[PDB]
Amino acid sequence: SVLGLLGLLVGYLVVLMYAQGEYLFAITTLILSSAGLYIFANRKAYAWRYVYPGMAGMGLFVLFPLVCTIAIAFTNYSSTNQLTFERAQEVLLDRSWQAGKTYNFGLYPAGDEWQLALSDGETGKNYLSDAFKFGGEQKLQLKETTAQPEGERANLRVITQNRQALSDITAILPDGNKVMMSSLRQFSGTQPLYTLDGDGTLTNNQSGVKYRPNNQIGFYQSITADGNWGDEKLSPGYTVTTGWKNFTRVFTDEGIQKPFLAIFVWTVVFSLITVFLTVAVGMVLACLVQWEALRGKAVYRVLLILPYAVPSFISILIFKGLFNQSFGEINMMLSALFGVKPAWFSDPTTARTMLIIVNTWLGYPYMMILCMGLLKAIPDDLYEASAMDGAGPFQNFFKITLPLLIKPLTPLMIASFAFNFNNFVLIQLLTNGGPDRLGTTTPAGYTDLLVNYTYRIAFEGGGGQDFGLAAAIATLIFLLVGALAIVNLKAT
Amino acid sequence: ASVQLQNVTKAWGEVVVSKDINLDIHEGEFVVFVGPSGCGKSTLLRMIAGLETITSGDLFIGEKRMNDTPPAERGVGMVFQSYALYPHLSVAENMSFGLKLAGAKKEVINQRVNQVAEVLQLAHLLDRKPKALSGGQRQRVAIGRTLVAEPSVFLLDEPLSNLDAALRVQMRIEISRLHKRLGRTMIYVTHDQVEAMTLADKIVVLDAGRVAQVGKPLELYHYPADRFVAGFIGSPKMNFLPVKVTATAIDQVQVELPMPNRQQVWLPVESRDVQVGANMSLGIRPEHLLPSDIADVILEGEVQVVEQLGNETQIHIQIPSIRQNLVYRQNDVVLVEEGATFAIGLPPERCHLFREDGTACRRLHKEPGV
Amino acid sequence: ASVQLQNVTKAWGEVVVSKDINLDIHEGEFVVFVGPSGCGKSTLLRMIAGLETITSGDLFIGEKRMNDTPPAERGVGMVFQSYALYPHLSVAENMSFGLKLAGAKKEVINQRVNQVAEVLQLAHLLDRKPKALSGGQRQRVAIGRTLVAEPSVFLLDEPLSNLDAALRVQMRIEISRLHKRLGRTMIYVTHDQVEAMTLADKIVVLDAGRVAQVGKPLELYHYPADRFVAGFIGSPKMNFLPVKVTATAIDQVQVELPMPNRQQVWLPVESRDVQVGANMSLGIRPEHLLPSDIADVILEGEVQVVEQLGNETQIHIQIPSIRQNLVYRQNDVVLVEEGATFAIGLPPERCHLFREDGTACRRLHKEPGV
Amino acid sequence: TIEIIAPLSGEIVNIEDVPDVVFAEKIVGDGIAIKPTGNKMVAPVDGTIGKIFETNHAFSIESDSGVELFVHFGIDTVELKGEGFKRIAEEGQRVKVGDTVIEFDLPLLEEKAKSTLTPVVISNMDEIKELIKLSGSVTVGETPVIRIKK
Amino acid sequence: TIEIIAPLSGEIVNIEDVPDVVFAEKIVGDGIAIKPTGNKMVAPVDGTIGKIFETNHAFSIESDSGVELFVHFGIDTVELKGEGFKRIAEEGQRVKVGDTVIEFDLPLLEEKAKSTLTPVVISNMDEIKELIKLSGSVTVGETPVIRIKK
Amino acid sequence: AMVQPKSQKARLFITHLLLLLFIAAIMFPLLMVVAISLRQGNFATGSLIPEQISWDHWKLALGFSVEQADGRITPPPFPVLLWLWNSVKVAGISAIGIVALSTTCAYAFARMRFPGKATLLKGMLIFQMFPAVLSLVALYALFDRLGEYIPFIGLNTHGGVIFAYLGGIALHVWTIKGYFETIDSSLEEAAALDGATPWQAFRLVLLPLSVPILAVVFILSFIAAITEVPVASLLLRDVNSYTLAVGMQQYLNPQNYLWGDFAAAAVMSALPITIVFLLAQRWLVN
C-alpha cells in the first residue's frame, strides 16, 4: 500500500540520474533500490527486510567502488585528463585576449574579507561582487547596484602588496563580459579567444585557427581544412574512453612490467613471512599466557596486547622516527654497543628487514588473541589424559595442541595473508616507498607492495598521475588477492 | 593396588568441599563413589589420580605416599565422562597414545592394541576418527585405552552418562564382566544409586564431601547411617515419619506418631544416645509395608495416584490422621481405583529411626544377607 | 481440545522422518510420546504446535484443520527443554509475556500470575532474574508460563531432563497431581520408559518415526506389538529366545528351543496364519520366570553375576544347553554365590512370540486389567 | 554470625519430613519446619518484608544484614483461599523480631488444610557460607532456630 | 542398491537375540545372525578385506561400493585362541562373492565355544540410508540376506 | 590444580624470564615515546637518556604558544586538539551507522531461516576480503561527482568520510551474529506462541539482550574509525579539517623534522584511546 509513495522517488530520481550524465551511478541507484522496494513490499520475504540495510552499505560503499575501479580500467583518467569534454570547453571559452574596455575599480573590504566593486563609465550602471579572500584564482559573480559602495577605497600600497592575488581575479558581469585587472586603477573587459557554433568546433579569434575535439587522446586538436590530425594541441585535456591499452602496456614489455613483476614477488613474500612469524609467535605466547602453572597471567596478558592495542598510525610512525639513519634513538644505541649503523631507509635489503620487524610487532598480538580464544575450544580432558600417560609440556604442544589447531587456523591463516598482501597502512606511512627504483616511467620502490604501487601511480606528488592505469592494475590485483577467497571458503 | 585414604582434606581457600575422610580399599575390590551432582565424588576421584592436589592428609596407593607423586608415576589409568578421545588421531592411535610417547615400540604397540580390540570388538574400526564413531563405540575406545596401558588401578569417572536409557542399563553388566575377568582394583563413580548397587562390592555414599557411610551394598539398603543415605538408596524414596519419643529401653525405643490419634509403637532399634521428648524421624520403605490384614498397627487412608509398572505396582496413600503422604509398593498387579479406601500395616521390625541431627540408630533386627 | 492426526507425513527433501501416523487423542487424556534418541518424538510435538511445517496429512485440534493455522492462534501452550525463559525480564513478566502483548489487562495479569505463583511457590520470586534461580526453580517458571495462558492443550517437551537424579523421580508425582487437578489434554515427551508408564493414560511408542504401538501402559507391558516395544519397555531387558515352530493347533503354537536338547513347549498364543519351520523369536520377562520346581520346562544353569538391589535380587544364569545368558529377577533377597548351579522354570502362559519381521503373535492368556 | 528467631511457637521438625516435594527436596531453600501450636506469625529477623501472598498464608522477609528469608504456613494452604488467616503487617513495612505479621486460627486450619507443618527456608543460599539447624521446642519470637554465617 | 550375500549356510536369526550386549543392542552395527551348519565363512560382497583377527574367528571387509561389513563367528570365541579355526584369506587381499575366507570345524565349535551364532553387521551405518533384512534358510555364498541402500 | 612433575620451577622460571624480556622488548618503542616528552629538544645527537626535562612538547602539542629565551614566542606547530576532536566527529557518527546496519542484518544470519542465507554469507565474507584501500582511485572520483550534487557528503567534508566507513561492516556483523547464537534458540519460537511477530519479538526480546555486544562493536568500530588512514587522508585536504590519524603525518616531515613534538601528540593519541581499547577488549564475557 505504501509502494505508491516509495515508487515516486525510485524513477523520478533515476531519470534525473539518467539525465545530466552520470550513467555509471544511475544503474546502482535503480538496481539496489528496486530490489529494496520489492523486499519491503510483500510479506512473502520477511527475512530479507533485515539483511537489506546491511547490503545497502555493502552494495554502495564496497561493491560499487569495486565495480567502478574495474570500469576506470578501460577509461583514460589521468592528470592531463581529469574532467570530461563538456567541462573542458568552457574553460577554453574563458581564455581570452584583451579588448580594452574601461572599468575603474575600488577595493572595499567587508568584515574579515575583501569585496570587489567595479564602476562602468559607458552604461553608467555600477557593478558589485561578493565577499572573497585573496588566494589563487577565482571567478566572482557581480550583481547590479546603482548606489555608490560604502567605505573608502584601499590606497596604492594595499593593492600593490596583494597584486598577485588581485590580478588572478577573473570576475564576471551580469551581462556576460569577463573582467580582469589591467592596472592598479583599472580593470578591463575582454572578448573570448574562442567561439563555439553548431558543431563542437572551436575557432580562435586571434590566430584564426580552428580546433576540433580529438577523442583518440582526449585533447583539442587543429587541422588546416584537411585530414584529422596535425598541428598544435591544447592540454586542458578531457577524460576519454579507451581500449585495453592500459592492460597491454603492463603485459607487453615496456618499463612498467619490470618493477611490477619484481614487487609482486616481494609482496607475496612479505605477507608469507609476516603470517609465518606472527602465527608462530602468537601461538607460542597464547599457550604460555593461559598456562595453568603461572603467576601473573592477568598482568602478562595486557602488556602483550599493547602493540595491537595502540593504533596503527601512531605505532608505525614512532618506528619511522626511531629507525632514521643519521638521527633516531635506535641507531644511536646500535652505534653504542655495536659499531654498525644499518641503513633502514636507503639500503634495499636492510629496509625490508625493518618492515617485517614492525609488522610482526603489530601482527603477533592479534594472532595471540585469535589463537588464545581458539585454544579454549580444546577440552582440558585431552591434556589431563596425556598427563596420565606421562606426556611432557613440549610433547603436548607438538602432538596434541598444534595438529589440532592447524585445522581451524587454516582459513584464518590465509586470511591474514590476504590482509598483509594489501597492507597499505604500513608501507605508505613508514617508508613511503623506501628505496626508490631507478629507471622507471612510473613511481616505484624496492619496498612497495602492489596496493602502494597502484596508489603511487594515481596520487604521486607530480609523478604523472594515471588514474586509469592505477585502476587497471588494481583490477589485476582484484583477480589475484580477491579470487583467493575460493580456497578460503570452498576448501575450508 | 590397595588404595587407602587417611584424613584427606581438600579446600579452595576457605571453602572446605571435603572434610577429613577415611577410606580403606583392598586389592581387587570394586568400590563406587555415589552422591548428588557435585559433592566431592567428582573431585575425590581426581585427587586419587593426581589430577587434583591434596590440601592435607596422606594417600597410600599400594603402601606408598602419592600426594606429591605426579599422576604418571602412580601407575593408574582413567576413563573420563567425555571419554577424552583425541579428534586428530585414529582409534588405534588413541588406545596406543600412552605407549607411543615416552618409550615407543612400534611392533609391540600393534600387538597390544589388537589384543584389546579383540575382546572389545574394535578391530574393524581401528583406522577411524572418533567423530565417525557412535556414542557406544566411543566409550569402548576410552575403556580400551586404559586396558592397553594395563595399570595397577582403574578409575572410572562416570562412563555410562553419555549413553541412551536402555543402553546404559544393558552396558551395566559389561562393567561387571570387565571386573571379574581382569580381577583388579576399580574406583567407579556415578550419580545414579541403582548403578552402584548392581556393581559395587563396597559403596561409598558422599554428602557435601563428607563420607556418609561405607560398606556392602546390602548394608546401605538395610542399615543406613543417616536420613541422607536412607532417602538416597532405593527405587522409590523411603517414607519419613516425624514421630516423638515417649520412652526408651535396654534395646527398644517407643515412639508416638504425629497423628491426632497419637498411637505408640515399640521399634526394635538401638536405644543408645536418645533423649525422650525429642522429635525424631521414623523411616519405612514402601516395599516393606504390609497389607492391613496381617499387621496390628493399622493405618487407614485414601488412594491418590496409582502407578502401574507391570512388574511392580506403586500406590500413593494420603493418611487422614498423620499429615503425610505414604508410598506403598506391592509386587505383581493390584487393581485399585483412585479414591477407594485402602489400609496398610506398619511393621516395627522394618522401621528406621533418625535423630534431629540426622544420625540413625542402628537396627537390631537381623536381616538376611548381612 | 481433542487433538487427532490422520496420515501425517513429514520429510526433509528425501529423508522421511515420519511415516503416515494416526493418533486419536480424546479430551482430558494424558498422552506421552516415547522412543530412542531421535525417532519422531522430537519433531512430532513441534508439528502439533505449529513450530514445524507439515508435509502431508491433517491436524485436528478440537475438530478443526490447523495445518495452515499459525502457532499463536491455535490456542495451545508449550514448555521447551531449555525452558525458553527471557533473561531480561522478571519471572512475573516471563509468565505474563503472553497477556502483556496483544490486548493487555494490568488488573487481570497481576491476578493470573499470583494464582499460579502461589501453588508453584514462586510468589516470593516474582521480581527476580531467571539467572538468579536454580535449575529446579527455572522449570517451575516455564510450567507457570503456560498455566497463565490457560491453553486447550499442554505440550511438554521433556521438562524433567535438567533436574538431578533423585529430584527427577520425585517431581514425576507433581505432573500427576498437575493433571487431574487441572483436567485437560497434555502431550508429554520423554526418553525414559518409566516416566511414561507412571504418568500416561495412553502411551505412543515411536520407532524411527513409525508408530510401533499405541495404548494403555499396562497393555504395552503385557501385549506388545513387536520385538521393539517388548524390548523397549520394562526395567530389565526381556529375555529373547530364538525358537523354531514345529506344529500349530486350534489356538496355540508349539515351538522348539534352539538348544541342543531341543525341548518342545506349547505356547498359548494366536496360532492363525503361522508357517511351520519358520524361525521365530520367544520373549520372556525376568519377572515372569518361575523357579524350576513349579514349571515343566526345566532349565539348568550356572550363576555368573548376582545383583543385590535390596528390594529385589537379579541373577544372571548361564544355560549349559542354549548358548544364551538368561536373566532372572526375584523379589525380596536371594543369597546365591557366583558359580553355583541354579535352575529356573519357563512358564508358557507368560510368553511372547515374535515373527522374523518383528510382528508379535497376540497373546491369548487373559490378564486382569486389559 | 546471624541468628534467626522462630516465627511461631512449636517443635522443630526436619525439613525433609515435610509432606511436599517442593520443600523436602530443598528447591525453595534450606532450613527447618515448625509444628504450629501458637496463633501468630512473627517476623523472624530485623529487616524489610519482601512480599506477602494474596491468600495471606505466607510472606517473605529480607534482613538488614542481607538475608532473604521465606516463611510458608502449612502445605497446600493456598487451596483454603485465605480462610482462617488475617493480615496485620504490610508489604514493604519495616519490622523487628517480635513483631506480629500474620495471625491465624489453628484448629480451623488443622481440620481443613492437608498439613499444618510450616517450612522456614532461605532464598539466597549463595550468600550464606555456613548454616546450622537447631532442635527442640520453641516459643513465639524468642527461641532461635537457625544460625547462618555470611 | 547393493545386496549382501550370506557368508555361511544356515538359518537367518534376528540380531537382537544374540547373547551379547555388543551385538544385540546393535552397538558394533546392524544386521543379522545365522545358525552355522556349513564349514566356511565366505566374503559377503565384492571388495577389499580390511582386517582379520589373530584368533582367526572373524574378519572385516569393505565393499567397492563403500560399505564396511563385519563377520564374527560365535560370541566370546576368542578364548579358544584359534583352536578349531583355520586361516585361508589374507589381510588386504581382494575378493569376490563366493570366495572362501575362513574355514571352521563345526562339531568341535558346537561343544566348545560360548556360542555358535554368527552375527553379520555393517560398521558404517551413516552411509546407508535404508537397510532391509531377509528371512528363511540360506546357503554358502549364494542366498542373499541383507539388501542395503547407499 | 594438577600435580606437577620436574619440580616445575625450572620450566616456569625460563618462561618468566623470556616473557619479561619479550614484554620489555615490545614496550621499548612505547617507552621511548614517553622518554622523548621528557627530553629537551627534537635533536637526536647527544646522550640517549634525557639530559634535561622539558615541557615544550607537553605544551606545544597541546595548544600553547609558550617558548624559551633564544627562540621567540612560537605558536603550536600544528593544531592537535582540532584534530583529536575531528576524529571524534568522524568516528562518533560512523560508529552509529555501522551499528545501525549491522544490528538488524546480523539477526537474520543467526536466528532465522531463509534460502538466501547460504549464498549470502558466502558473499559477505568474500567482499570484505577485498579492502576499501584498493579502490582509493574510484573513491576520489565517486565523491567528486557526488560532491557537486550533494555538497555535505562530497570531497573534503566530514560526511564524505562518514559515508565511506558504512561499507565495511561484514566483519562487525559476524561478531554480533556470533553473540546471537549464544542465546538459547528457543527464545524466538517461544515469543511466537504468545502471539508476537518476528519483528515484535526482535524488538522486545533479543535486542535489549544484545545491548552489551552492540556497545562492544560500537566502541571497537569507534577505535577502528579513529585509526582509518588511507581513505581519510585521500578524502581530506584542508589543514584545519584533518583528523588525528591524518595530521600526525605532518609531524614527520623531511624538511621540517619535528620529532620532539611528536611525543605529546603520541600521548594524546594513545592515552585517551589506551584506557578505552583495553577495557573494550575485556568487556566481552558472553
mmCIF file with all atom_site columns, N, CA and C in Angstrom, chain B residues 185-224:
data_model
loop_
_atom_site.group_PDB
_atom_site.id
_atom_site.type_symbol
_atom_site.label_atom_id
_atom_site.label_alt_id
_atom_site.label_comp_id
_atom_site.label_asym_id
_atom_site.label_entity_id
_atom_site.label_seq_id
_atom_site.pdbx_PDB_ins_code
_atom_site.Cartn_x
_atom_site.Cartn_y
_atom_site.Cartn_z
_atom_site.occupancy
_atom_site.B_iso_or_equiv
_atom_site.pdbx_formal_charge
_atom_site.auth_seq_id
_atom_site.auth_comp_id
_atom_site.auth_asym_id
_atom_site.auth_atom_id
_atom_site.pdbx_PDB_model_num
ATOM 1   N N  . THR B 1 185 ? 41.702 -53.689 41.167 1.00 0.00 ? 185 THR B N  1
ATOM 2   C CA . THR B 1 185 ? 41.021 -52.580 41.821 1.00 0.00 ? 185 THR B CA 1
ATOM 3   C C  . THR B 1 185 ? 40.414 -51.597 40.824 1.00 0.00 ? 185 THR B C  1
ATOM 4   N N  . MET B 1 186 ? 39.149 -51.249 41.042 1.00 0.00 ? 186 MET B N  1
ATOM 5   C CA . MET B 1 186 ? 38.462 -50.270 40.206 1.00 0.00 ? 186 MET B CA 1
ATOM 6   C C  . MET B 1 186 ? 37.656 -49.304 41.063 1.00 0.00 ? 186 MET B C  1
ATOM 7   N N  . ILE B 1 187 ? 37.827 -48.013 40.807 1.00 0.00 ? 187 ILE B N  1
ATOM 8   C CA . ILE B 1 187 ? 37.087 -46.992 41.532 1.00 0.00 ? 187 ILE B CA 1
ATOM 9   C C  . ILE B 1 187 ? 36.070 -46.339 40.604 1.00 0.00 ? 187 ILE B C  1
ATOM 10  N N  . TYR B 1 188 ? 34.856 -46.877 40.609 1.00 0.00 ? 188 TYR B N  1
ATOM 11  C CA . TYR B 1 188 ? 33.785 -46.386 39.755 1.00 0.00 ? 188 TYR B CA 1
ATOM 12  C C  . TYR B 1 188 ? 33.111 -45.191 40.421 1.00 0.00 ? 188 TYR B C  1
ATOM 13  N N  . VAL B 1 189 ? 32.534 -44.305 39.616 1.00 0.00 ? 189 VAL B N  1
ATOM 14  C CA . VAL B 1 189 ? 31.840 -43.130 40.132 1.00 0.00 ? 189 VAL B CA 1
ATOM 15  C C  . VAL B 1 189 ? 30.533 -42.934 39.373 1.00 0.00 ? 189 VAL B C  1
ATOM 16  N N  . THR B 1 190 ? 29.451 -42.661 40.097 1.00 0.00 ? 190 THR B N  1
ATOM 17  C CA . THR B 1 190 ? 28.151 -42.469 39.464 1.00 0.00 ? 190 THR B CA 1
ATOM 18  C C  . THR B 1 190 ? 27.199 -41.644 40.322 1.00 0.00 ? 190 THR B C  1
ATOM 19  N N  . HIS B 1 191 ? 26.186 -41.075 39.676 1.00 0.00 ? 191 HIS B N  1
ATOM 20  C CA . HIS B 1 191 ? 25.176 -40.275 40.359 1.00 0.00 ? 191 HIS B CA 1
ATOM 21  C C  . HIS B 1 191 ? 23.880 -41.061 40.541 1.00 0.00 ? 191 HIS B C  1
ATOM 22  N N  . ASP B 1 192 ? 23.726 -42.122 39.755 1.00 0.00 ? 192 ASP B N  1
ATOM 23  C CA . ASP B 1 192 ? 22.554 -42.984 39.846 1.00 0.00 ? 192 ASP B CA 1
ATOM 24  C C  . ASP B 1 192 ? 22.769 -44.047 40.917 1.00 0.00 ? 192 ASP B C  1
ATOM 25  N N  . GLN B 1 193 ? 21.856 -44.108 41.880 1.00 0.00 ? 193 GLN B N  1
ATOM 26  C CA . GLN B 1 193 ? 22.003 -45.015 43.015 1.00 0.00 ? 193 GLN B CA 1
ATOM 27  C C  . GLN B 1 193 ? 21.898 -46.486 42.614 1.00 0.00 ? 193 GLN B C  1
ATOM 28  N N  . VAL B 1 194 ? 21.161 -46.757 41.542 1.00 0.00 ? 194 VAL B N  1
ATOM 29  C CA . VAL B 1 194 ? 20.993 -48.121 41.052 1.00 0.00 ? 194 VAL B CA 1
ATOM 30  C C  . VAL B 1 194 ? 22.309 -48.631 40.478 1.00 0.00 ? 194 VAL B C  1
ATOM 31  N N  . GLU B 1 195 ? 23.049 -47.720 39.853 1.00 0.00 ? 195 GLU B N  1
ATOM 32  C CA . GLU B 1 195 ? 24.306 -48.044 39.192 1.00 0.00 ? 195 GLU B CA 1
ATOM 33  C C  . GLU B 1 195 ? 25.344 -48.578 40.177 1.00 0.00 ? 195 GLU B C  1
ATOM 34  N N  . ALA B 1 196 ? 25.294 -48.084 41.409 1.00 0.00 ? 196 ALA B N  1
ATOM 35  C CA . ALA B 1 196 ? 26.237 -48.503 42.439 1.00 0.00 ? 196 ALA B CA 1
ATOM 36  C C  . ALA B 1 196 ? 25.883 -49.871 43.018 1.00 0.00 ? 196 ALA B C  1
ATOM 37  N N  . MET B 1 197 ? 24.599 -50.073 43.293 1.00 0.00 ? 197 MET B N  1
ATOM 38  C CA . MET B 1 197 ? 24.115 -51.296 43.930 1.00 0.00 ? 197 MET B CA 1
ATOM 39  C C  . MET B 1 197 ? 24.377 -52.551 43.101 1.00 0.00 ? 197 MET B C  1
ATOM 40  N N  . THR B 1 198 ? 24.245 -52.430 41.784 1.00 0.00 ? 198 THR B N  1
ATOM 41  C CA . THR B 1 198 ? 24.396 -53.574 40.889 1.00 0.00 ? 198 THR B CA 1
ATOM 42  C C  . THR B 1 198 ? 25.857 -53.920 40.628 1.00 0.00 ? 198 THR B C  1
ATOM 43  N N  . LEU B 1 199 ? 26.743 -52.958 40.857 1.00 0.00 ? 199 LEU B N  1
ATOM 44  C CA . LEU B 1 199 ? 28.150 -53.123 40.511 1.00 0.00 ? 199 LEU B CA 1
ATOM 45  C C  . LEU B 1 199 ? 29.056 -53.337 41.719 1.00 0.00 ? 199 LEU B C  1
ATOM 46  N N  . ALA B 1 200 ? 28.967 -52.429 42.684 1.00 0.00 ? 200 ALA B N  1
ATOM 47  C CA . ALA B 1 200 ? 29.954 -52.341 43.757 1.00 0.00 ? 200 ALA B CA 1
ATOM 48  C C  . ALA B 1 200 ? 29.973 -53.512 44.735 1.00 0.00 ? 200 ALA B C  1
ATOM 49  N N  . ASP B 1 201 ? 31.158 -53.767 45.278 1.00 0.00 ? 201 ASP B N  1
ATOM 50  C CA . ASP B 1 201 ? 31.327 -54.647 46.422 1.00 0.00 ? 201 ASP B CA 1
ATOM 51  C C  . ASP B 1 201 ? 31.320 -53.767 47.666 1.00 0.00 ? 201 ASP B C  1
ATOM 52  N N  . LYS B 1 202 ? 31.777 -52.530 47.488 1.00 0.00 ? 202 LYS B N  1
ATOM 53  C CA . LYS B 1 202 ? 31.849 -51.552 48.566 1.00 0.00 ? 202 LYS B CA 1
ATOM 54  C C  . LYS B 1 202 ? 31.432 -50.173 48.066 1.00 0.00 ? 202 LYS B C  1
ATOM 55  N N  . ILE B 1 203 ? 30.277 -49.700 48.522 1.00 0.00 ? 203 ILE B N  1
ATOM 56  C CA . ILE B 1 203 ? 29.758 -48.404 48.096 1.00 0.00 ? 203 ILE B CA 1
ATOM 57  C C  . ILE B 1 203 ? 30.190 -47.314 49.071 1.00 0.00 ? 203 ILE B C  1
ATOM 58  N N  . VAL B 1 204 ? 30.564 -46.154 48.539 1.00 0.00 ? 204 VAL B N  1
ATOM 59  C CA . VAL B 1 204 ? 30.911 -45.012 49.376 1.00 0.00 ? 204 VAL B CA 1
ATOM 60  C C  . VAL B 1 204 ? 29.978 -43.846 49.070 1.00 0.00 ? 204 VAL B C  1
ATOM 61  N N  . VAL B 1 205 ? 28.969 -43.664 49.914 1.00 0.00 ? 205 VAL B N  1
ATOM 62  C CA . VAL B 1 205 ? 27.998 -42.594 49.728 1.00 0.00 ? 205 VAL B CA 1
ATOM 63  C C  . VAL B 1 205 ? 28.542 -41.276 50.267 1.00 0.00 ? 205 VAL B C  1
ATOM 64  N N  . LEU B 1 206 ? 28.595 -40.264 49.406 1.00 0.00 ? 206 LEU B N  1
ATOM 65  C CA . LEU B 1 206 ? 29.117 -38.955 49.788 1.00 0.00 ? 206 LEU B CA 1
ATOM 66  C C  . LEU B 1 206 ? 28.007 -37.918 49.905 1.00 0.00 ? 206 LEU B C  1
ATOM 67  N N  . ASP B 1 207 ? 28.155 -37.008 50.863 1.00 0.00 ? 207 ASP B N  1
ATOM 68  C CA . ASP B 1 207 ? 27.187 -35.938 51.066 1.00 0.00 ? 207 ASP B CA 1
ATOM 69  C C  . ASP B 1 207 ? 27.919 -34.645 51.394 1.00 0.00 ? 207 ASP B C  1
ATOM 70  N N  . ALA B 1 208 ? 27.924 -33.719 50.437 1.00 0.00 ? 208 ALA B N  1
ATOM 71  C CA . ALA B 1 208 ? 28.642 -32.452 50.571 1.00 0.00 ? 208 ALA B CA 1
ATOM 72  C C  . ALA B 1 208 ? 30.119 -32.663 50.908 1.00 0.00 ? 208 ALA B C  1
ATOM 73  N N  . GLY B 1 209 ? 30.707 -33.709 50.335 1.00 0.00 ? 209 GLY B N  1
ATOM 74  C CA . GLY B 1 209 ? 32.105 -34.026 50.563 1.00 0.00 ? 209 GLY B CA 1
ATOM 75  C C  . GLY B 1 209 ? 32.318 -35.048 51.664 1.00 0.00 ? 209 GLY B C  1
ATOM 76  N N  . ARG B 1 210 ? 31.599 -34.873 52.766 1.00 0.00 ? 210 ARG B N  1
ATOM 77  C CA . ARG B 1 210 ? 31.683 -35.777 53.906 1.00 0.00 ? 210 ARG B CA 1
ATOM 78  C C  . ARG B 1 210 ? 31.230 -37.189 53.543 1.00 0.00 ? 210 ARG B C  1
ATOM 79  N N  . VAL B 1 211 ? 31.978 -38.188 54.003 1.00 0.00 ? 211 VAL B N  1
ATOM 80  C CA . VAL B 1 211 ? 31.581 -39.579 53.826 1.00 0.00 ? 211 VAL B CA 1
ATOM 81  C C  . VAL B 1 211 ? 30.426 -39.910 54.764 1.00 0.00 ? 211 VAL B C  1
ATOM 82  N N  . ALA B 1 212 ? 29.279 -40.246 54.186 1.00 0.00 ? 212 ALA B N  1
ATOM 83  C CA . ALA B 1 212 ? 28.105 -40.599 54.974 1.00 0.00 ? 212 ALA B CA 1
ATOM 84  C C  . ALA B 1 212 ? 28.224 -42.008 55.545 1.00 0.00 ? 212 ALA B C  1
ATOM 85  N N  . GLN B 1 213 ? 28.537 -42.974 54.684 1.00 0.00 ? 213 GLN B N  1
ATOM 86  C CA . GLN B 1 213 ? 28.671 -44.364 55.107 1.00 0.00 ? 213 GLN B CA 1
ATOM 87  C C  . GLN B 1 213 ? 29.473 -45.181 54.096 1.00 0.00 ? 213 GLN B C  1
ATOM 88  N N  . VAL B 1 214 ? 30.173 -46.200 54.586 1.00 0.00 ? 214 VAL B N  1
ATOM 89  C CA . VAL B 1 214 ? 30.931 -47.107 53.730 1.00 0.00 ? 214 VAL B CA 1
ATOM 90  C C  . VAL B 1 214 ? 30.624 -48.549 54.113 1.00 0.00 ? 214 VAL B C  1
ATOM 91  N N  . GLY B 1 215 ? 30.325 -49.381 53.120 1.00 0.00 ? 215 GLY B N  1
ATOM 92  C CA . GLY B 1 215 ? 30.045 -50.781 53.380 1.00 0.00 ? 215 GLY B CA 1
ATOM 93  C C  . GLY B 1 215 ? 29.495 -51.541 52.189 1.00 0.00 ? 215 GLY B C  1
ATOM 94  N N  . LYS B 1 216 ? 29.071 -52.775 52.443 1.00 0.00 ? 216 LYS B N  1
ATOM 95  C CA . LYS B 1 216 ? 28.492 -53.631 51.419 1.00 0.00 ? 216 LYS B CA 1
ATOM 96  C C  . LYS B 1 216 ? 27.167 -53.045 50.933 1.00 0.00 ? 216 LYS B C  1
ATOM 97  N N  . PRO B 1 217 ? 26.782 -53.347 49.681 1.00 0.00 ? 217 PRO B N  1
ATOM 98  C CA . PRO B 1 217 ? 25.554 -52.810 49.078 1.00 0.00 ? 217 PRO B CA 1
ATOM 99  C C  . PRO B 1 217 ? 24.293 -53.089 49.897 1.00 0.00 ? 217 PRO B C  1
ATOM 100 N N  . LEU B 1 218 ? 24.215 -54.263 50.514 1.00 0.00 ? 218 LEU B N  1
ATOM 101 C CA . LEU B 1 218 ? 23.047 -54.622 51.314 1.00 0.00 ? 218 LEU B CA 1
ATOM 102 C C  . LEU B 1 218 ? 22.987 -53.821 52.611 1.00 0.00 ? 218 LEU B C  1
ATOM 103 N N  . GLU B 1 219 ? 24.154 -53.435 53.121 1.00 0.00 ? 219 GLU B N  1
ATOM 104 C CA . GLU B 1 219 ? 24.230 -52.684 54.368 1.00 0.00 ? 219 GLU B CA 1
ATOM 105 C C  . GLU B 1 219 ? 23.632 -51.288 54.230 1.00 0.00 ? 219 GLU B C  1
ATOM 106 N N  . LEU B 1 220 ? 23.859 -50.652 53.085 1.00 0.00 ? 220 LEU B N  1
ATOM 107 C CA . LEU B 1 220 ? 23.327 -49.313 52.857 1.00 0.00 ? 220 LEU B CA 1
ATOM 108 C C  . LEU B 1 220 ? 21.811 -49.361 52.723 1.00 0.00 ? 220 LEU B C  1
ATOM 109 N N  . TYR B 1 221 ? 21.308 -50.463 52.176 1.00 0.00 ? 221 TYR B N  1
ATOM 110 C CA . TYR B 1 221 ? 19.875 -50.641 51.987 1.00 0.00 ? 221 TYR B CA 1
ATOM 111 C C  . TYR B 1 221 ? 19.171 -50.969 53.301 1.00 0.00 ? 221 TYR B C  1
ATOM 112 N N  . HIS B 1 222 ? 19.768 -51.861 54.085 1.00 0.00 ? 222 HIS B N  1
ATOM 113 C CA . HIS B 1 222 ? 19.152 -52.325 55.325 1.00 0.00 ? 222 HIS B CA 1
ATOM 114 C C  . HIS B 1 222 ? 19.503 -51.465 56.541 1.00 0.00 ? 222 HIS B C  1
ATOM 115 N N  . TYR B 1 223 ? 20.771 -51.085 56.663 1.00 0.00 ? 223 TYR B N  1
ATOM 116 C CA . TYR B 1 223 ? 21.231 -50.342 57.834 1.00 0.00 ? 223 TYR B CA 1
ATOM 117 C C  . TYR B 1 223 ? 21.925 -49.034 57.456 1.00 0.00 ? 223 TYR B C  1
ATOM 118 N N  . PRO B 1 224 ? 21.138 -47.993 57.144 1.00 0.00 ? 224 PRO B N  1
ATOM 119 C CA . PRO B 1 224 ? 21.686 -46.682 56.780 1.00 0.00 ? 224 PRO B CA 1
ATOM 120 C C  . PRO B 1 224 ? 22.330 -45.979 57.972 1.00 0.00 ? 224 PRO B C  1
#
